[PDB]
Design a protein around this ligand. Structure first.
Ligand SMILES: *C(=O)CC[C@H](NC(=O)CC[C@H](NC(=O)CCCCCCCCCCCCCCC)C(=O)O)C(=O)O
Length: 29
C-alpha cells in the first residue's frame, strides 16, 4: 500500500486541506 496519507499532496494535491485534524479522521470516527 501507499496510503499516501503523506504524499497525498505531491500525488493528489493538497494535504493540509483537512488542516491537520485528519489525524482524528480515523480516530474519532
Ligand atoms: C484531496 O482531498 C485529494 C483528493 C482525495 N482526497 C481524499 O481522499 C482525502 C485524503 C486523501 N486520500 C486518502 O484518504 C488516502 C489515504 C490512504 C487511506 C487511509 C489509510 C489509513 C491511513 C493510516 C495512516 C497511518 C500513518 C502512517 C504514517 C504516514 C489523502 O490521502 O490525503 C483523494 O483522491 O484521496
Amino acid at each position: 500500500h501507499a496510503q499516501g496519507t503523506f504524499t497525498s499532496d505531491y500525488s493528489k494535491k493538497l494535504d493540509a486541506r483537512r488542516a491537520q485534524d485528519f489525524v482524528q479522521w480515523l480516530m474519532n470516527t
